[PDB]
Swiss-Prot record:
Annotated spans, Important for RNA-binding: 3-6
Motif (DEAH box): 103-106
Processing after translation: Acetylated by host KAT5. Acetylation modulates NS3 RNA-binding and unwinding activities and plays an important positive role for viral replication.
Protein name stated in the entry: Serine protease NS3
Topological type in the membrane: Peripheral membrane protein
Binding site for ATP: 12-19
Residues annotated as site: Involved in NS3 ATPase and RTPase activities: 274, 277
Lumenal side stretches: 1-435
Role according to the record: Displays three enzymatic activities: serine protease, NTPase and RNA helicase. NS3 serine protease, in association with NS2B, performs its autocleavage and cleaves the polyprotein at dibasic sites in the cytoplasm: C-prM, NS2A-NS2B, NS2B-NS3, NS3-NS4A, NS4A-2K and NS4B-NS5. NS3 RNA helicase binds RNA and unwinds dsRNA in the 3' to 5' direction. Leads to translation arrest when expressed ex vivo. Disrupts host centrosome organization in a CEP63-dependent manner to degrade host TBK1 and inhibits innate immune response. Inhibits the integrated stress response (ISR) in the infected cell.
Residues of the full protein shown: 1681 to 2115 of 3419
Length: 435
């Protein structure tokens, strides 16, 4: 695996021991060969599990998710996918890693896709080696891969709203269920219906994942209601998955706005990862996977792959050269390499809008490419009437930094800034000049 110009896809089935068995063996061999190595975890939760699995090896944990004193001598760095891409974008020195290991390498967040593009380009140039660890590599067509124990697969109508009758199988279960929903708002409604029926429900999504995931360990629960974030190495002691087989797809319409299309079918890779939360214990056969629709390759035209090009266009590789997307996922976007390359000052603005601003890549790009400075929030108020953001069916309102009450009406409308109450609260604070 460790020879220059090699990219290895470590595609053992879910729970085959890629993280707990194979990764420490790879790391021991890398230190032996004096290979400067990076290990990319999808989430802080996974970074912490890796620290436990690599305990006793010289690894620098570039995450506050791990409280450990470093020797100062480590040639192996461990950080989140997003942290890798973030450091490449910033005027911060990132070493030339000889070996690039990405765990949960199916992750379709823009920063993960960009990290794969950068790494796979370095390998294709003959500059480095890489290992992508995932049961479900890009373009996989198998929603039903092997497992540690036999799984009971059942195609069944799954509720996507509160229900009063007709789904007794859902609540009649006495074990623990992980239930994949397409959105936070859809999970809230299902969670409330289960709570009313006497169930203990934990809800997970991207913004709450680190905090809430700990509850699955510290308290008893009947259901976990989760978005697609639990596809990225989240482990549960569960015996059933309920899978809507539905997701939302961000779509850029007419180059001018982002909508959240769907819900629509998940990819085969997503379905396999959702299913792969169970069947993990060889001593407990007959875990259940109930699934409520088909799969389709909905990553085609999905805004994350265009956002990944925006990130890679703004990352230095070699003189004018720009990293390509990893070949198997490179057709998911119709884009010109370099089309999103910003001049130094607009790139700095782009970075700050993502990092401090917490804006979606697409929206950060529109603002930075328009020549707007990070603190200039006039654009949050001067859009067309149909860009009005609504809150409880009235136009949303904030007090500007000038102390004026104004309707939130952004010049560029990205549905992700108001997809739930927490998102819209964050965007209101942004529009108000509070960060
Ligand atoms: F009530 C005010 C007086 C002066 C400036 C602003 C406000 C409103 N609150 C706010 C919005 N952004 N930052 C602060």
């Amino acid at each position: 695996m460790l020879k220059k110009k090699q990219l290895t896809v470590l595609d053992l089935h879910p729970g085959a021991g890629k993280t707990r068995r194979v990764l420490p063996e790879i790391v021991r061999e890398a230190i032996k060969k004096r290979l400067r190595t990076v290990i990319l975890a999808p989430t802080r939760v996974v970074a912490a599990e890796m620290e436990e699995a690599l305990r006793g090896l010289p690894v620098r944990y570039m995450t506050t998710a791990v409280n450990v004193t470093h020797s100062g001598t480590e040639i192996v760095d461990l950080m989140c996918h997003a942290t890798f891409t973030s450091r490449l974008l910033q005027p911060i020195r990132v070493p030339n890693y000889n070996l690039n290991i990405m765990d949960e390498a199916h992750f379709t967040d823009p920063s993960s896709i960009a990290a794969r593009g950068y790494i796979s380009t370095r390998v294709e140039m003959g500059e480095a080696a890489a290992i992508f660890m995932t049961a479900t590599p890009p373009g996989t067509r198998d929603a039903f891969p092997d497992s540690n124990s036999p799984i009971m697969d059942t195609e069944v109508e799954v509720p996507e709203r509160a229900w009063s009758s007709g789904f007794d199988w859902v609540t009649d279960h006495s074990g623990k269920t992980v239930w994949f929903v397409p959105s936070v708002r859809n999970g809230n409604e299902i969670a409330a219906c289960l709570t009313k029926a006497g169930k203990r429900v934990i809800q997970l999504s991207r913004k709450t994942f680190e905090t809430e995931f700990q509850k699955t360990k510290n308290q008893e629960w009947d259901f976990v209601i989760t978005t697609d974030i639990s596809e990225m190495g989240a482990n549960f002691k569960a015996d059933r998955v309920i899978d809507s087989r539905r997701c939302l797809k961000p779509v850029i319409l007419d180059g001018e706005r982002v909508i959240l299309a769907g819900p629509m079918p998940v990819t085969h890779a997503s379905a396999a990862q959702r299913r792969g939360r169970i069947g993990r214990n060889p001593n407990k056969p007959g875990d259940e996977y109930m699934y409520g629709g088909g799969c389709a390759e909905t990553d085609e035209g999905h805004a994350h792959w265009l956002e990944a090009r925006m990130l890679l266009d703004n990352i230095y590789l070699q003189d004018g050269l720009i990293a390509s997307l990893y070949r198997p996922e490179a057709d998911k976007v119709a884009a010109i390499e370099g089309e999103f390359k910003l001049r130094t000052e607009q790139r700095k603005t782009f970075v700050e809008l993502m990092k401090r601003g917490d804006l979606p890549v697409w929206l950060a790009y529109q603002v930075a490419s328009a020549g707007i400075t990070y603190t200039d929030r006039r654009w949050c108020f001067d859009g067309t009437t149909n860009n009005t953001i609504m809150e409880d069916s009235v136009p949303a309102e904030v007090w500007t930094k000038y102390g004026e009450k104004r309707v939130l009406k952004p010049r560029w409308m990205d549905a992700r800034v108001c997809s739930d109450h927490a998102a819209l609260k964050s965007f209101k604070e942004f529009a108000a000049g509070k960060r």
